[PDB]
Amino acid sequence: GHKPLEVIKIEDGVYLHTSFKNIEGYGLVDSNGLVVLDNNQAYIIDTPWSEEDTKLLLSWATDRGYQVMASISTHSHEDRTAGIKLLNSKSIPTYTSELTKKLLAREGKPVPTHYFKDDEFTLGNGLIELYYPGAGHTEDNIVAWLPKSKILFGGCLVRSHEREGLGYVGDASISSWADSIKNIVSKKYPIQMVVPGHGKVGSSDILDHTIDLAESASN
Amino acid sequence: KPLEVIKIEDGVYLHTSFKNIEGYGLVDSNGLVVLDNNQAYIIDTPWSEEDTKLLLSWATDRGYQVMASISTHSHEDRTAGIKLLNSKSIPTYTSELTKKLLAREGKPVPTHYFKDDEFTLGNGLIELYYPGAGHTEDNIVAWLPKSKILFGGCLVRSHEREGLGYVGDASISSWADSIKNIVSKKYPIQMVVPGHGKVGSSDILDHTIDLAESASN
Lengths: 219, 217
Ligand SMILES: [Mg+2]
Ligand SMILES: [Zn+2]
Ligand SMILES: [Zn+2]
Ligand SMILES: [Zn+2]
Hints:
The structure is a homodimer. By secondary structure, the first copy, chain A, is of the alpha/beta class. The first copy, chain A, has a single domain (1-219), classed as 4-Layer Sandwich (Metallo-beta-lactamase, Chain A). The first copy, chain A, is 27% helix and 31% strand. Chain A is built from 6 helices and 12 strands. Chain A has helices at 51-63, 78-81, 84-89, 98-106, 174-186, 205-218, and strands at residues 6-11, 14-23, 27-38, 41-45, 67-72, 94-97, 114-116, 120-123, 128-131, 143-146, 151-155, 193-196. In chain A, the strands form 2 sheets. A 7-stranded mixed β-sheet of chain A has the order 1-2-3-4-5-6-7. In chain A, helix 5 links the parallel strand 11 (151-155) and strand 12 (193-196). Chain A is globular. The first copy, chain A, starts with 5 loop residues before the first strand and ends with a helix. Chains A and B meet through strand 2, strand 3 and helix 2 of A and strand 3 of B. Residues 75, 77, 137-138, 156 of chain A line the site of one zinc ion (ZN). One zinc ion (ZN) is lined by residues 31, 77, 79, 156, 197-198 of chain A. Chain A: Zn(2+) 1 binds at residues 24, 75, 77, 79, 137. Chain A: One of its GO terms (biological process) is antibiotic catabolic process. Chain A: Zn(2+) 4 binds at residues 79, 156, 198. Chain A: Residues 30-198 form the Metallo-beta-lactamase domain.
């Protein structure tokens, strides 16, 4: 029994959704995704951490008259993909990279109904730019760039300022992590904000901070 | 990663369980196996029925007879293995309050329970005490007169740490007073074992009170 999904506007047409989980002995932990609006059309970047909170996110959208067009999950882990089954059941198109899809299939988890094969892909016909920069937090982590709001959703490939560790490295490729962040920087996005998969939103600085953590863990 | 087990004194084993929480990291959870000859008593079951079966096999591979388990409160953290020990017909113990709390949530209940604020297990091997609400409304602590160890469970917080943990079921304004009741026993404490984290001295005790006299502020 935890507190419910929270949804708040961080830019024009961009909402941060945050779900929560009780971690006994530690306390309450947060997990972020985004909803991106294109007129009356809504696109979900990473599902909430549970099916129950995914239901609340869909209710949030439909109560405002929005049409949920698609979701994209930025890697295969539960906190990115928990809602995929529910969205599939409502015939809402679900997306991941090809690798992410096949990773889910191997662990016998529900898979998206759609997937992209190349290092770049777009959702909402240019609204959301997706990019695979290399392995880091996981083999398959991708990032999402929003040209209009100039928001980079880094997911778990990036660490908030409040953290001085990489977090869960069980599926990680630490010696590749720093290079993967560098690849994002090389894209030369005019980043105004970076949204992490956990913790507070920040600036371009998050990338440098993440590179420091990666290079420390590998040394 | 799989269950771990560690000698921390003659006749006292620390068992630590782990499980992957996707989206944050790996968590640990502590309990004890206390021995009287070949008779073993478990303080808090591991976090899973799997790890509990592993903990049982650890005991029976060494010829130990598992006499009973005690759970320090009703959270799955501490009672996950009750139904297994029940199925294996091994006596399971909690406070009466913890038992009633488990029945209401429709979760497995222990076969045994004590009704007072004090209760002794083994033949003096383990002294149980209910100091009042803190982590939960029902949390109890276990004192080991021989090893002079106090198992604090989640009613206590290691340092190497902060943040009283999950306080959803907590009585934060009651916490500090509950901890002081444990000091009232004047147990010749030389060691404290928290439900999570590292093993410490009688300092872990005073530390936990600072956090309660701070969250209630
Ligand atoms: Mg991928
Ligand atoms: Zn992850
Ligand atoms: Zn995550
Ligand atoms: Zn608890």
